[PDB]
Amino acid sequence: AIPTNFTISVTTEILPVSMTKTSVDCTMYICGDSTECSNLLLQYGSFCTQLNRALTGIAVEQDKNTQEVFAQVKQIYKTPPIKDFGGFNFSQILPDPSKPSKRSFIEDLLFNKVTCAQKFNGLTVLPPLLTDEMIAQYTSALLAGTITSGWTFGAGAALQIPFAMQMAYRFNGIGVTQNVLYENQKLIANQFNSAIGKIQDSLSSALGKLQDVVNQNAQALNTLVKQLSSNFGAISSVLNDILSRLDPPEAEVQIDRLITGRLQSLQTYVTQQLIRAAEIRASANLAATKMSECVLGQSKRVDFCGKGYHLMSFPQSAPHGVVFLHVTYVPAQEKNFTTAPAICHDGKAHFPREGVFVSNGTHWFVTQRNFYEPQIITTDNTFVSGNCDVVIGIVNNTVYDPLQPELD
């Protein structure tokens, strides 16, 4: 079966990159405004220092992951002032001048879909490093580099190249020649525009991957806040009330039990945060590998940069994540023909170079492994390598020679 029709499709992949940066205090969460509580907690200061060091490690790991993900080039590129690419239309992925930020329409649409009280108990939020404006500028520079070059900027100097020749070179990587694009450029452009429109209409009313982490963090914070009201085997959850109604000789054991319970809760929360940080690190490494092996240069890895033949990719920003938009060429309508191994003319067994022999029912033509292109079998398209008695299933057919009429 040889496919005869195709349709350009665009996929969408959502991958988290980082999460929130929270920091928990020890004295504010356990004690507060007391003296005996602090004197009893000073004996367990090593655990507090270890938890603070683990929190700082998670914080610096998140920043390192963000720096490794949202940084691929060293030169900021801008979009050309001339809006001409050869039938195509690139207007939704570019940052709109009406918005004060450097985000496009798709980024602003996907940002709206994602949805001091916690800081009272010592649960503070650390300021991130990479702001939204810097990420938007990085994405715009990457898009400009991809539309002005493609893969030459990701390995050395920036080489200028028109979009038509870049698309032809990308199509040549899977075996499709250039005539298919130079003869059906308007059709491919219309299919790409229709796919972009369908994706834009589908993204507008989904993004649970960039929300489940925030939901789990909020639930963990609510659980930590509610744990401050538990008794832990005592009669109340107020240290001042216990010190007022009971004497220190009869409340030291209760204070010790409360401190032990809160330390166990903090240790469990730190373990959960470490597991979440490891998951975020794995997701960020996967996203960085996909960015390096899909957007920067076209790879031949089957099922890695989409579903189908990967052509090019458009990186898009996302809050606490990243949006990937690949170009997956997939064949559509196909037909049915009969094949043949080799050709047996004057004893020699002619084998094709990189094509395939087909026949509609009478004549024999030679085409490729992609589009049906009926051609005439000549001496330059086939090579000899033996006789016909060693090849199993070889048929007899004549071979046309255009050199003979040229000599007469």
The distance of closest approach from Cβ of residue 306 to another protein in the complex, given in angstroms and rounded to an integer, is: 5
Residue among 230, 244, 378, 387 that touches another protein (CB under 8 A):
230
Asked if 351 interacts with a second copy (CB under 8 A), we say: yes
Q: Tell me the CA distances in angstroms from 256 to 35, 38, 202, 233, one per residue in order.
A: 14, 11, 57, 11
Residue among 187, 356, 395, 399 that touches a second copy (CB under 8 A):
356
Measured from the CB atom, the residue of 70 and 105 that comes closer to another protein is 70
Asked if 231 interacts with a second copy (CB under 8 A), we say: yes
Do 45 and 228 meet the contact criterion of CB atoms below 8 Å apart? Answer: no
DSSP 45-61: HHHHHHHHHHHHHHHHH
Sign, Cα dihedral of 156, 161, 166, 168 = negative
Asked if 29 interacts with another protein (CB under 8 A), we say: no
Q: How far apart are CA 54 and CA 64, in angstroms?
A: 15
26 binds, among another protein, a second copy, none (CB under 5 to 8 A by kind): none
Asked if 181 interacts with another protein (CB under 8 A), we say: no
Q: Which of the residues 340 through 379 are near another protein (CB under 8 A)?
A: 340, 356, 358, 367, 370-372
Q: Which of the residues 186 through 215 are near a second copy (CB under 8 A)?
A: none
Measured from the CB atom, the residue of 160 and 205 that comes closer to a second copy is 160
Measured from the CB atom, the residue of 35 and 75 that comes closer to another protein is 75
User: Between β-strands 349-352 and 382-384, what pairing exists: parallel, antiparallel or unpaired?
Assistant: antiparallel
The distance of closest approach from Cβ of residue 141 to another protein in the complex, given in angstroms and rounded to an integer, is: 8
Task: Please name every residue paired with 331 in a beta bridge, in sequence order, or none if there are none.
Answer: 6
The distance of closest approach from Cβ of residue 334 to a second copy in the complex, given in angstroms and rounded to an integer, is: 6
Q: How far apart are CA 223 and CA 205, in angstroms?
A: 33
Residue among 28, 109, 144, 180 that touches another protein (CB under 8 A):
144
- Residues 394, 369, 295, CA angle at the centre, nearest 5°? 150
Q: How far apart are CA 329 and CA 6, in angstroms?
A: 8
Please state whether 73 falls in left (phi above 0), alpha (psi between -120 and 50) or beta.
beta
Q: How far apart are CA 130 and CA 70, in angstroms?
A: 8
Q: How far apart are CA 218 and CA 118, in angstroms?
A: 10
The distance of closest approach from Cβ of residue 395 to a second copy in the complex, given in angstroms and rounded to an integer, is: 14
Residue among 102, 103, 326, 350 that touches another protein (CB under 8 A):
326
Do 199 and 104 meet the contact criterion of CB atoms below 8 Å apart? Answer: no
Q: Which of the residues 284 through 313 are near a second copy (CB under 8 A)?
A: 292-293, 296-297, 299-304, 307-309
Distance of CA 397 to the CA centre of its chain: 51
Please state whether 114 falls in left (phi above 0), alpha (psi between -120 and 50) or beta.
beta
Q: Which of the residues 306 through 325 are near another protein (CB under 8 A)?
A: 306-308, 318, 320-325
Asked if 46 interacts with a second copy (CB under 8 A), we say: yes
Q: Which of the residues 256 through 295 are near another protein (CB under 8 A)?
A: 256, 259, 262-263, 266-270, 273, 276, 280, 283-284, 286-287, 290
Residue among 38, 42, 112, 119 that touches another protein (CB under 8 A):
119
Q: Which stretch binds a second copy (CB under 8 A): 14-22, 88-96, 156-164, 188-196?
A: 156-164
The distance of closest approach from Cβ of residue 219 to another protein in the complex, given in angstroms and rounded to an integer, is: 24
Asked if 407 interacts with a second copy (CB under 8 A), we say: yes
